[PDB]
Amino acid sequence: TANILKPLMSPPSREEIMAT
Amino acid sequence: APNLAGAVEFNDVKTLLREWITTISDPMEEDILQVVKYCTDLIEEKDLEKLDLVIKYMKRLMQQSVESVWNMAFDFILDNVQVVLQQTYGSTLKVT
């Protein structure tokens, strides 16, 4: 609804984590 | 699946905007925001044609209107449209 905001970018998933 | 106020078909959007910018001379932000939501959904639903048309229609009607209000409304609407484009397509709408 009109008064709820959220980032466009999804956070790094579990995979993109495994390796850093 | 992107609707403005239920308005999904393009021209239903286009009339609905026309009536909105034509009747009202101090629009509630509630409404302004839903247009911004509508446009970012068009980006997310992959409908850049529609969005490019929509942007322009209301660029014309909004900057034509004597209310400065509408003129700032558009600037806001486009700014949010562009930071989202810039992150989804890596581009910014060309607005001549």
């Binding site: 905001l5 959220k6 790094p12 | 930071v83």
Partner: protein, 198 residues
């Protein structure tokens, strides 16, 4: 009413820790990335992964100016399941009280540590989540106002949008309060809504 800038820094610092902690306790990311640390005089987990920390930092950098003006009703850490349906929600509900109460700034670490301690053990009371859960943060604003978007949109690389029905709706929620606290200028409540079969 209006929160201050320093209150708003406090709150954001606090939420950063918390979001980190929730992420660990609910196993959104595996424990390999967390490192013990100490805030509010109590132990905590914080990811070491740089991309992760930037996301969260970015998220809260943006929320701050809205807290400054006390323009936020709820910051919400939503945990989504493998099919992008919400399984769990951690809600921070922020309120202004209208004097005899505790001084927030004088007693910061006492007051916020409580929140921190409860999140730490909260798994005792929730059900275990499905695997491959990801997360998101949602900000409920007090008003549906344009200024909110002007102020949150401070990072060109990190845009915000208006969320929809999909992002928010949870089916058959259950409510697990964790903490409530009241003070000089700020009342905050933490609570969990979890999905009835998860």
């Amino acid at each position: 009413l209006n929160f201050g800038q320093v209150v708003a820094d406090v709150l954001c610092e606090f939420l950063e820790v918390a979001v980190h902690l929730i992420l660990y306790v609910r196993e959104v990311y595996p424990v390999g990335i967390f490192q013990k640390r100490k805030k509010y005089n109590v132990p905590v987990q914080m990811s070491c992964h740089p991309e992760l920390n930037q996301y969260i930092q970015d998220t809260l950098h943006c929320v701050k100016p809205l807290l400054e003006k006390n323009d936020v009703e709820k910051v919400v850490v939503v945990i989504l399941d493998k099919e992008h349906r919400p399984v769990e929600k951690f809600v921070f509900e922020i309120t202004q009280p209208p004097i005899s109460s505790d001084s927030l700034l004088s007693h910061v670490e006492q007051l916020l540590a409580a929140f921190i301690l409860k999140i730490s053990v909260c798994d005792a009371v929730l059900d275990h989540n499905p695997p491959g859960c990801t997360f998101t943060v949602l900000v409920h604003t007090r008003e549906a106002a344009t200024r909110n978007m002007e102020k949150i949109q401070v990072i060109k690389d990190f845009p915000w949008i208006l969320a929809d029905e999909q992002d928010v709706h949870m089916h058959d929620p259950r409510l697990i309060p964790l903490k409530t606290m009241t003070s000089d200028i700020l009342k905050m409540q933490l609570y969990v809504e979890e999905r009835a079969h998860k």
